[PDB]
Amino acid sequence: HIDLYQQIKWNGWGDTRKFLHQLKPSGTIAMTTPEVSSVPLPSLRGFIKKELTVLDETPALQIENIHVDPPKQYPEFVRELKAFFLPDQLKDDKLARITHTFGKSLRDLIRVRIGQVKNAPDLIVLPHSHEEVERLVQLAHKYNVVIIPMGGGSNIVGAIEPVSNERFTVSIDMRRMNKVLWVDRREMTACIQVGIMGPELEKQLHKQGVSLGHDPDSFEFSTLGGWLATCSSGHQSDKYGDIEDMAVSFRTVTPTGTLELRAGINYKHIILGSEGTLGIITEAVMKVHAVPQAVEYYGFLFPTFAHAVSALQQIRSSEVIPTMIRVYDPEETQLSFAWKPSKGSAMVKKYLHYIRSFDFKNVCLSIIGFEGPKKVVDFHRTSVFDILSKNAAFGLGSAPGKTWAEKRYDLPYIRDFLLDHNMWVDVAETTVSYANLQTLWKDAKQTFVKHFKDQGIPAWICAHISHTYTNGVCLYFIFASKQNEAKKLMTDIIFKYGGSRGWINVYRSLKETIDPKDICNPR
Amino acid sequence: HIDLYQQIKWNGWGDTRKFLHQLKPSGTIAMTTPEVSSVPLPSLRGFIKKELTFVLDETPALQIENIHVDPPKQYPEFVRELKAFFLPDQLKDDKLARITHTFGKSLRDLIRVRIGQVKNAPDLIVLPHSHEEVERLVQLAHKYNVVIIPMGGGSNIVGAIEPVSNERFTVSIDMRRMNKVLWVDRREMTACIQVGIMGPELEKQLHKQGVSLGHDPDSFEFSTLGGWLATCSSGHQSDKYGDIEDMAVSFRTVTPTGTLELRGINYKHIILGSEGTLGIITEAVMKVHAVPQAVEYYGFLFPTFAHAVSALQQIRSSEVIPTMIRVYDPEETQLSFAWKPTSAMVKKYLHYIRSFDFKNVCLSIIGFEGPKKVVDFHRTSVFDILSKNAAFGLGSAPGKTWAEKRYDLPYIRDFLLDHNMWVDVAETTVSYANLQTLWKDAKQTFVKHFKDQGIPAWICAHISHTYTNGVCLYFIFASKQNYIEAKKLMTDIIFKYGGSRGWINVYRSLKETIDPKDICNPR
Numbered sequence A: 001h002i003d004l005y006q007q008i009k010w011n012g013w014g015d016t017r018k019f020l021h022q023l024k025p026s027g028t029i030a031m032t033t034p035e036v037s038s039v040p041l042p043s044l045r046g047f048i049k050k051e052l053t054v055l056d057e058t059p060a061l062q063i064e065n066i067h068v069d070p071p072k073q074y075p076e077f078v079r080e081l082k083a084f085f086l087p088d089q090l091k092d093d094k095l096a097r098i099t100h101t102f103g104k105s106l107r108d109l110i111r112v113r114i115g116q117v118k119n120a121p122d123l124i125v126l127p128h129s130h131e132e133v134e135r136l137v138q139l140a141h142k143y144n145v146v147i148i149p150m151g152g153g154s155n156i157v158g159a160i161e162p163v164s165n166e167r168f169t170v171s172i173d174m175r176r177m178n179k180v181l182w183v184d185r186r187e188m189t190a191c192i193q194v195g196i197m198g199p200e201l202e203k204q205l206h207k208q209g210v211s212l213g214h215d216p217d218s219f220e221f222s223t224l225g226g227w228l229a230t231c232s233s234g235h236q237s238d239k240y241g242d243i244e245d246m247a248v249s250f251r252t253v254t255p256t257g258t259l260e261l262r263a264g265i266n267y268k269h270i271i272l273g274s275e276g277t278l279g280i281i282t283e284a285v286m287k288v289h290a291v292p293q294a295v296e297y298y299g300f301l302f303p304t305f306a307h308a309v310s311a312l313q314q315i316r317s318s319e320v321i322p323t324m325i326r327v328y329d330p331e332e333t334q335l336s337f338a339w340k341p342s343k344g345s346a347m348v349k350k351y352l353h354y355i356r357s358f359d360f361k362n363v364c365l366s367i368i369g370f371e372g373p374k375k376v377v378d379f380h381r382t383s384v385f386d387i388l389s390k391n392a393a394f395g396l397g398s399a400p401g402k403t404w405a406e407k408r409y410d411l412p413y414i415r416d417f418l419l420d421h422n423m424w425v426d427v428a429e430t431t432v433s434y435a436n437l438q439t440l441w442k443d444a445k446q447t448f449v450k451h452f453k454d455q456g457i458p459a460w461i462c463a464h465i466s467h468t469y470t471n472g473v474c475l476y477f478i479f480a481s482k483q484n485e486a487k488k489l490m491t492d493i494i495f496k497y498g499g500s501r502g503w504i505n506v507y508r509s510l511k512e513t514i515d516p517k518d519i520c521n522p523r
Numbered sequence B: 001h002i003d004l005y006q007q008i009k010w011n012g013w014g015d016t017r018k019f020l021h022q023l024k025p026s027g028t029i030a031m032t033t034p035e036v037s038s039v040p041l042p043s044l045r046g047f048i049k050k051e052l053t054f055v056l057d058e059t060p061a062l063q064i065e066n067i068h069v070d071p072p073k074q075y076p077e078f079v080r081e082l083k084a085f086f087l088p089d090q091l092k093d094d095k096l097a098r099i100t101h102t103f104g105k106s107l108r109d110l111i112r113v114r115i116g117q118v119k120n121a122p123d124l125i126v127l128p129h130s131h132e133e134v135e136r137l138v139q140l141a142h143k144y145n146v147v148i149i150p151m152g153g154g155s156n157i158v159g160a161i162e163p164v165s166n167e168r169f170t171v172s173i174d175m176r177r178m179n180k181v182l183w184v185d186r187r188e189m190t191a192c193i194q195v196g197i198m199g200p201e202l203e204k205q206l207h208k209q210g211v212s213l214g215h216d217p218d219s220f221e222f223s224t225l226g227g228w229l230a231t232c233s234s235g236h237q238s239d240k241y242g243d244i245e246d247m248a249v250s251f252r253t254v255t256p257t258g259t260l261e262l263r264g265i266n267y268k269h270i271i272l273g274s275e276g277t278l279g280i281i282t283e284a285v286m287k288v289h290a291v292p293q294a295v296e297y298y299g300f301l302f303p304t305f306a307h308a309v310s311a312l313q314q315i316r317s318s319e320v321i322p323t324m325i326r327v328y329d330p331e332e333t334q335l336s337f338a339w340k341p342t343s344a345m346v347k348k349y350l351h352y353i354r355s356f357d358f359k360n361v362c363l364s365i366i367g368f369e370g371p372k373k374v375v376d377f378h379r380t381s382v383f384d385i386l387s388k389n390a391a392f393g394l395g396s397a398p399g400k401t402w403a404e405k406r407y408d409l410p411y412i413r414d415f416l417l418d419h420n421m422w423v424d425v426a427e428t429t430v431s432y433a434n435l436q437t438l439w440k441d442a443k444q445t446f447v448k449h450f451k452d453q454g455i456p457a458w459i460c461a462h463i464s465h466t467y468t469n470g471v472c473l474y475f476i477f478a479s480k481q482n483y484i485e486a487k488k489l490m491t492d493i494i495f496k497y498g499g500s501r502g503w504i505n506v507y508r509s510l511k512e513t514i515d516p517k518d519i520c521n522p523r
């Protein structure tokens, strides 16, 4: 047995066996993966050179060179844990502790990379079942011990990081509770241990003919319980609904008892989005759907960002909407084509041909997907394609199943490579009305570029649209520079374009009732 | 100015100017409406004779002057403070005012008001004009320790507005003068709406601005937005427009400890479905939709209930669903045709039942709304499934009128109560597996328990909602007056076929925190 915390990078993203690196002789960048031989990416080096000027090397510290204060001691608590849990279910070695300290924001990565580990948990517990979680929480309440559940640790808001250090603190790693317990194909529901990781969930559901359909960009390295405790957004939500809609019921172990769910109050909304501050979700009954009989993904190009946005609007107004759509601005478009694996070219050829008639400085890629019954897919496809025709979309063709849409999963791998070579990249996500969209998009990019160009520093910024609403979009900025304010600059300008409480007392009452001792992820 | 409570029947349903009545000496039953007087329904007398055996015995309700209501309690300091802020026309404590703010519209309610049994009246009715006036009232009620119970249409059937005890001075806050749409945002597709607005008034005001809400409970005509919110009522176009909680973007709620405003935890769900126990909703921002370009409603006949249910199942599995569907069992089908003042529908049904025994034939009404292209796609998909299940087409008729006859049914209850009869309902969710046997067994058990006694009884059902593995089955059962003997019998057989709490302590802390003195609809 290797635990997930050992298989996922302790100072970067995702699988330890998957990473970008440079190949001899010429410094070609290549993607190593566990299943496939290293795949060269011939254009990527040239792209990084163009946009941001040998690559300077800035390796992270090795784990033996990282100092972590010894764990606190709580002999009597630990004794009671020892009497119930197996030895392999309790860890306090350095690796264990570091990996249960940090999420995956840039702030986390920077800090772990330079060895700044100021508030590790004292102990990691890996329970096997709901009944073991109940015992652990019983004991944590009895002894006044802080508990912080962790799934993938992919959050970017510091949600798993211990805040204080007065009490003994335990990280409850949920990832050994990773079984689909049953699938009811008549109710179309599945009961699922929430420590399960995205691709493991989908693989186990597929075996029974079903799927969940929740697809955040962190799909590969985040868990069902994490999705539920954060209310994360998914990129097939137009078809399958938001996570809160997919959640029929779930069990929550709290300091004051297990809370069970089945015109009055709908109590699931008290726990969804609570970030481990109100107890530990253990098992969830989720709404599933039959594996779709038709799955079709298509790429398109638009002469400008304005044409794409226009199609986005018209598609939404026609009321016949794709399962997934994403629109890439010209910079993210160029990055998408610069990332063309020579191993493992037809659409790269269509893009090169297109950019002879239309300026590449302006060309946007769109990826559009459809799933469902053949008849439904056919109707939706034909409806959207007709709207695409009216907005000067140029078709790049299909490719086959879902893999046009699983290339967003590779992006965080690029961040690690950048961090290793004197660069950083960060993101800002905003909702913005169509009225302000093209003006904020243009102004944010020009402002950010010029602020670094005016100091003699290279800097690059792209954007994509991932979600559309009645009167707006979700706009996602990615911005990169060289290692030496930039967050504040993007934030100020987002606010300057309309881009995105007695309830405190209601929450306080819930929290004091549910968690009298404030042991649950105290904030 | 006439208040809504003066325009709605104080001892029956709906508009004081609309009712069924018996013409004399002919005995023909007729329907009066404020637009046309005494429209004969030539088949309805014969239907009533057939099913429940010809002179109708008369059982008139008591006149209001013959009804005793204990005088209001007095609370001079409280009332003095109210009198300083509220206009005299806003405060009522006459008998009519007290009676119409005591009872809902359940059978138990109607029975009690009709024999003059008024045990628990509020002491005062307050009709506020604005959010700011509700805030003052709730402040004053908390200061003086005065129970407050908000009311909309008073259409609920669970005793939700009926004062429970008489220790404290009790006020009914009639929301119905707060009945304006305050704005419509047609780019966002939201409207801000004072929640005392009645259903048809809401849709009329929204239509003026090119939008619609689409929430449609069977009580639509005489219930309010605030009632829908505070009860999470179900609506019969929800497959298309979503549930009331999905339509609710935000709202303001005035509580004994402050006004709770809405834009982690999604707090709206603490208040939706709270039945006035956690404060008073005053204004809501609701999701609206453009008035649809196509609205098409069709009728179909099926040779048996089993065929109809089959079509229901296969329609849902096809994933292409109508806006509204209802399936009427053979007894409710017969009632629907016997309720005839369209004449072409009767003609087709009469012809069909020459080929198929009428004792088995079920009517279905199926509607589609949306963009023409969407309506066309859904119509043609559903029509073809309907072919596979022996559905016979009755045609259309024009707009939504096929679908607004359900609004007239409670008017029939009043007429029955005036003629030595009663009628009640039980709704249940039930799996497709148990559906047909619960349907057959409930109907048969119910008639036999009365026929064994030498007493007429009639029972029908319809299906109003379908789910993945089930339906919502609605029973309507009627007999002669001589409720609790036959309701229990139904209640038991539903419980038989699988027909449709540490959270209590969560609720208690919310309620103790929000409403320390327990003035909000104390239970």
Ligand SMILES: Cc1cc2nc3c(=O)[nH]c(=O)nc-3n(C[C@H](O)[C@H](O)[C@H](O)COP(=O)(O)OP(=O)(O)OC[C@H]3O[C@@H](n4cnc5c(N)ncnc54)[C@H](O)[C@@H]3O)c2cc1C
Binding pocket: A103, A104, A105, A148, A149, A150, A151, A152, A153, A154, A155, A156, A159, A160, A174, A194, A195, A215, A216, A217, A218, A221, A222, A223, A224, A225, A226, A227, A228, A229, A230, A231, A232, A233, A234, A274, A275, A276, A277, A279, A280, A281, A282, A412, A521
């Ligand atoms: C590259 C990248 C892409 C991302 N893309 C998206 C995206 O598209 N949409 C989106 O919303 N987010 C996205 N995120 C953020 C993040 O992945 C999501 O919030 C995700 O839901 C976190 O899941 P997790 O299993 O990693 O939770 P963790 O990081 O382990 O925990 C998050 C919170 O949930 C709590 N928690 C975990 N398990 C439980 C449990 N069983 N019971 C109670 N509380 C629990 C933790 O205490 C913590 O407060 C992204 C992050 C990265 C780094």
Ligand SMILES: Cc1cc2nc3c(=O)[nH]c(=O)nc-3n(C[C@H](O)[C@H](O)[C@H](O)COP(=O)(O)OP(=O)(O)OC[C@H]3O[C@@H](n4cnc5c(N)ncnc54)[C@H](O)[C@@H]3O)c2cc1C
Binding pocket: B104, B105, B106, B149, B150, B151, B152, B153, B154, B155, B156, B157, B160, B161, B175, B195, B196, B216, B217, B218, B219, B220, B222, B223, B224, B225, B226, B227, B228, B229, B230, B231, B232, B233, B234, B235, B274, B275, B276, B277, B279, B280, B281, B282, B410, B521
């Ligand atoms: C013939 C008939 C058909 C029906 N059909 C349906 C149906 O299809 N679907 C369904 O769900 N129900 C149905 N019902 C029940 C009922 O009409 C609904 O529950 C409706 O939502 C109640 O609305 P109302 O305005 O009359 O509320 P009321 O009866 O006035 O009040 C109901 C509850 O909500 C509270 N309330 C009212 N206003 C506020 C406010 N502003 N703030 C806080 N609390 C408030 C009251 O205190 C009470 O607790 C039906 C009832 C009848 C008689």
Ligand SMILES: CCCCCCCCCCCCCCCCO
Binding pocket: A047, A048, A051, A052, A104, A105, A106, A156, A335, A411, A412, A413, A414, A415, A425, A426, A427, A460, A478, A480
């Ligand atoms: C500098 C030119 C090369 C382009 C840089 C590639 C962009 C890398 C995107 C990585 C995004 C990972 C961040 C996830 C969001 C959470 O913090």
Ligand SMILES: CCCCCCCCCCCCCCCCO
Binding pocket: B047, B048, B051, B052, B105, B106, B107, B108, B157, B335, B409, B410, B412, B413, B423, B424, B425, B458, B476, B478
């Ligand atoms: C023999 C003809 C019978 C006519 C049937 C009329 C159905 C009347 C429906 C009454 C609506 C009742 C809903 C509230 C329930 C109260 O307890």
